[PDB]
Amino acid sequence: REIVHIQAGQCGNQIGAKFWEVISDEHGIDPTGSYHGDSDLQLERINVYYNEATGNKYVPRAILVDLEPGTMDSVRSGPFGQIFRPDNFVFGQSGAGNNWAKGHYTEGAELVDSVLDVVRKESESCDCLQGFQLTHSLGGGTGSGMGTLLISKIREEYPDRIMNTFSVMPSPKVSDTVVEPYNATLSVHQLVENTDETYCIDNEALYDICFRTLKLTTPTYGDLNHLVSATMSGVTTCLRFPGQLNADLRKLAVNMVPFPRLHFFMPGFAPLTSRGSQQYRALTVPELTQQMFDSKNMMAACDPRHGRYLTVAAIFRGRMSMKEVDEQMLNVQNKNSSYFVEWIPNNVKTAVCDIPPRGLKMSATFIGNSTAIQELFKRISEQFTAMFRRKAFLHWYTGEGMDEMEFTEAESNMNDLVSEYQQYQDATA
Template identity: 35%
Template sequence: MHETVTISIGECGNNIGAQFWRDCCTQSDLSVSGHSLHPQVPPPSNLFEEQVSSRFVPRAILLDSDPGTLANIRNSDLGFLFPPSACISGSYGAGNSFGNGCYDPDLLELIQEPLNDQIRIQAEKCDQTPNFNLFHSLGEGTGSGTTAFVLMHLKEEYRTSVFNCSVLPEPDASVVSPYNCILGLNYLIESSSAVLCIDNGYLTAKLGIGEINQYTSRQLVGMFESEKWWIPKYDQDAAYYQRHFYHSETMWKGEIVTSCLVSDTDKVIQEIEFGNTKLYNSGVIQSIKQQLDSFDLMFKRFKLRLLEKSPSIIISDKLNSYQAKIRFL
């Protein structure tokens, strides 16, 4: 199978990633330190790299602007699973701002060089250019902004497939979450091959906070370990953005649970089955529409206030172009 490098970004992405790798170890008969419990049955080589003494290390990079989340992972039972060089952090958070996560020079000075080095090292260990999986939240400054920075680098340096597991925030998660979400979605449209949408608000009401990471991890493990696992080929000139966004269904504690709500009139363009998990490539995902509506309202108010203060000011149409592209979904 094609090797895959997983990059967990931000607090939410690393919490999902921690649960994902814990479940991968369980599925692959590995201890949480990466040692094989049944050496005659090796874990999937697309996710793990074999080292000495029947020890397997995830093809993974853990990235956050705040060192706290990664410190918690290193101090947990997973602390010995990841080499120290795989954990990259800044010295403070992104302040829940897309701009800080993507463009803050102090943050980029700390993470850019070690991140690029780790991506290159992981890629050189693979037999061919690997696929990349990114776990993140679109509501956070790091999850949206730093993910955009990573996507730009992958698009420039590695013309390969990129899969995003993207957690969509609740509409009222924070004042700035619609901005973070819409700006982040623009980069997903530009640079990702496929996006699995996870609606945090919908799943919190249905499952409870403590189960969301487990639910998401269960889907991801089943997909990535499946021989059917497939990521659409990256095409820089592709114009059919809406074909790349998926919602999912899986059996959870005896009930079929969907990862997010979709329009009642939505048509399924494509269906992919991985055991108990099904991906649906379809039209209007309600959580994206809610974020776009909130963004529209806030942006109109912003423009009105700005024009009241400076009637002659010219407002850039860049954000409006983001909205137009996202309406393809």
């Protein structure tokens, strides 16, 4: 039932805020936490993400963390910034300097217990807490280093709850900072061991979509983040709205993750169409379905045609006949059955929800668990070793007390993870 949400660092707080902004609009909540909705379908499951305060006020079950105040003020002074519980702001002053070691071991060490206190206070207010969700980037210092420290501490207090993260991978196409492959590799190591489900949101993929597909010549984080919030709303539809699915996070993990370490998901969203003459066409289910599976629509920069899907979850939203959706989804599998492993029968599932996202008559959200995600970890691995071969920029991390061995076993873990994906790409029945 209840989910506790944590956003850490600049990126995590940025996309975390847009997420609450978007789903608040869907559930008919205004920026002061009052309900102004029509359908009651919007309150059926409102308690999943919102706490009910005195006076018919719904407040997000959200914890906001950062090692510097800047983004705290930014969120607090924005649209839907007043909706958040004021106790649930936990920030420092030092900042992490895009340094994983500062977030994970030195500066974050002091703030971490304050966060666990708010986490603990929210968990005890839950009827039956099902688990946690974290938004953060892997390329920085706070969301990457301190976000993973939070995951580790939270898992130790709630060892049987589901742990789920929306994790933004770094790309040289978007960001300037040379040490990002270092931060990401240390983070991936923590994620393979302490999360149950991780959505891989690749800034490299988000950039190609905005630049190539959407024709945005000067992409901003606001553009990228509006893709992320749309996808985050889509993948959480079946938690926040009733209908045909009696599903929570654990059931999703059980049916999406056939092997413990292989829990990194490839997300996608339809529709995506550049401005503007095509923005007025009516979307048909056949078109939604082809777009959803198109490699160029994927939100992790990896070619799904290079590998195989272990499992797929697809969710459609809006007014549409389920018969059309059924036929179309079966068409994709029957006509391209070599891209789905045959040792997992009937391994693509569909859910349809009546309420559509704001601004769209229809939409589809894609959750793919594909062996091709290895391309993402290979890319980060290449950048890592090019630098680590010569111990370049290592002093920023050893000056915080870290050893070289810790880097060696992080790259080691990621290389094995790559190997594991490769072995089911060639596994046959």
